[PDB]
Amino acid sequence: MILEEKDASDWIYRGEGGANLVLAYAGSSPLFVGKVIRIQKARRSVLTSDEQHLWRENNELISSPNKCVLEQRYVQNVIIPLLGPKHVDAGVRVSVSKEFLECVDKKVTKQRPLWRVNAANVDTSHDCALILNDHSLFDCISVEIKPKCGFLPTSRFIGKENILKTSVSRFKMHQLLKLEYIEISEESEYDPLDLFSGSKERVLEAIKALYSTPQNNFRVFLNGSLILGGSGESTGRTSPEIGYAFEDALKGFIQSHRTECFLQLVSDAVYGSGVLDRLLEIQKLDKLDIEGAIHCYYDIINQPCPICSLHALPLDESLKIVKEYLIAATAKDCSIMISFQYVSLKPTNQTFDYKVHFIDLSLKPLKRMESYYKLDKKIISFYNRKQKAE
Numbered sequence: 190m191i192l193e194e195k196d197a198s199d200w201i202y203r204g205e206g207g208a209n210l211v212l213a214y215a216g217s218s219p220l221f222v223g224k225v226i227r228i229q230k231a232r233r234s235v236l237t238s239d240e241q242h243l244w245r246e247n248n249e250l251i252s253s254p255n256k257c258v259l260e261q262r263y264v265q266n267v268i269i270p271l272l273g274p275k276h277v278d279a280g281v282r283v284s285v286s287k288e289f290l291e292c293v294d295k296k297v298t299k300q301r302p303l304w305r306v307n308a309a310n311v312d313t314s315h316d317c318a319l320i321l322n323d324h325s326l327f328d329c330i331s332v333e334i335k336p337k338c339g340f341l342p343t344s345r346f347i348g349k350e351n352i353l354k355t356s357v358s359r360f361k362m363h364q365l366l367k368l369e370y371i372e373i374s375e376e377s378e379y380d381p382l383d384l385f386s387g388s389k390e391r392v393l394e395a396i397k398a399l400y401s402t403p404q405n406n407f408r409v410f411l412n413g414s415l416i417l418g419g420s421g422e423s424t425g426r427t428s429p430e431i432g433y434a435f436e437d438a439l440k441g442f443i444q445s446h447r448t449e450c451f452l453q454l455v456s457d458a459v460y461g462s463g464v465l466d467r468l469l470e471i472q473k474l475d476k477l478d479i480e481g482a483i484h485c486y487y488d489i490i491n492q493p494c495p496i497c498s499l500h501a502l503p504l505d506e507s508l509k510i511v512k513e514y515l516i517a518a519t520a521k522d523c524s525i526m527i528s529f530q531y532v533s534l535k536p537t538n539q540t541f542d543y544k545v546h547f548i549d550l551s552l553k554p555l556k557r558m559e560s561y562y563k564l565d566k567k568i569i570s571f572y573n574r575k576q577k578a579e
């Protein structure tokens with residue numbers, strides 16, 4: 190089953206992260222109706238020598254022919270054993286022509302954030318792509334959430350100066366630095382600690398915060414069509430205008446105050462799904478925080494630790510720690526998609542069926558332990574610094 194230059198006409202922009210573009214099928218084929226295609230971007234072979242060393246315990250993973258089988262097996266072999274297979278769909282292998290990739294790249298350039306184009310195009314060196322269900326299909330209202338990390342570190346390896354790292358969420362400390370680099374306009378109201386808190390009340394607080402300031406953490410589609418949140422990027426606060434048209438968009442679906450109810454019914458969904466519980470235990474596979482795990486990284490890549498207990502560990506442990514760090518990084522950066530067509534909305538007294546799905550599940554590259562460390566370092570220095578302003 191191979192896609193050619195012709196079929197580039199049957200797929201249309203759904204959005205992108207840093208690593209991937211996502212098209213939704215607008216054609217007529219019964220093999221792609223209700224599918225998306227996830228295409229890897231190339232910034233400006235499957236696994237490095239170091240990574241092969243680190244994923245050694247993984248027969249199939251290490252042997253994948255391309256990246257797409259690589260993603261396919263990562264999700265299926267390493268992630269599904271953890272999150273569980275009602276909410277994760279690893280999604281199928283699909284061959285594509287290099288000419289199919291090119292025209293797609295050209296075709297949707299116009300629909301992308303410019304800074305996203307400055308950074309990467311699609312990788313036209315690929316012969317392949319992954320096809321996943323379109324979770325915005327089930328009148329389907331579909332909500333995407335990018336919860337980020339919903340706990341605080343407690344690590345012995347977090348030094349005296351950085352101990353704020355143990356009091357203040359990474360999300361909130363990062364909001365300040367994103368501002369500094371004009372990547373967001375205002376600070377986000379959302380707080381993942383409320384979402385992963387597990388309190389029914391606080392989970393709603395977070396859904397509210399997400400509506401006000403969605404940034405790249407909140408999206409809502411109807412019929413697979415964006416009606417709140419940025420496209421391939423973050424987005425500024427929800428103004429009364431923005432809200433007005435949203436309320437109007439909820440016309441019909443909800444019977445009502447249509448916005449107040451949407452939130453309530455998204456919140457009831459999330460909390461009664463309990464799906465944030467598992468994810469949180471996976472995020473917690475970061476047992477030592479980057480400031481601990483970074484030392485394990487250097488032994489693993491056979492390199493004198495520039496940062497210098499941890500180094501006297503058996504290699505089997507050092508490897509585990511790194512593996513676990515990166516599976517964690519996968520859970521910290523993934524998204525939940527909730528579909529609506531159970532939740533019973535009190536006022537109107539309606540009833541909604543729902544499905545929840547994890548998406549944006551991606552293998553983190555091992556070499557990224559270094560950027561992780563540098564980003565983290567920069568985060569806490571800028572926070573500590575803007576805290577001296579007192």
Ligand SMILES: O=P(O)(O)O[C@H]1[C@H](OP(=O)(O)O)[C@@H](OP(=O)(O)O)[C@H](OP(=O)(O)O)[C@@H](OP(=O)(O)O)[C@@H]1OP(=O)(O)O
Nearest residue numbers: 205206207208209363405422423518519521522549553557
């Ligand atoms: O480009 P952004 O919208 O700012 O998002 C990126 C995220 O992108 P995705 O939504 O595409 O997953 C990065 O992942 P990559 O696609 O670049 O690989 C991720 O990087 P890591 O998962 O490796 O951490 C990073 O997360 P973070 O900032 O927590 O390191 C996160 O940025 P934000 O979530 O902060 O916006």
Ligand SMILES: Nc1ncnc2c1ncn2[C@@H]1O[C@H](COP(=O)(O)OP(=O)(O)O)[C@@H](O)[C@H]1O
Nearest residue numbers: 204205206207208209211321322323324325549
């Ligand atoms: N299976 C899916 N169904 C519906 N929409 C999706 C699906 N996968 C991704 N999307 C949309 O496309 C966007 C980008 O996809 P994603 O896989 O998160 O890219 P990246 O890995 O680079 O972050 C997401 O924000 C999401 O809104």
Ligand SMILES: [Mg+2]
Nearest residue numbers: 206208549551
């Ligand atoms: Mg990704």
Ligand SMILES: [Zn+2]
Nearest residue numbers: 484494496497
């Ligand atoms: Zn060290």
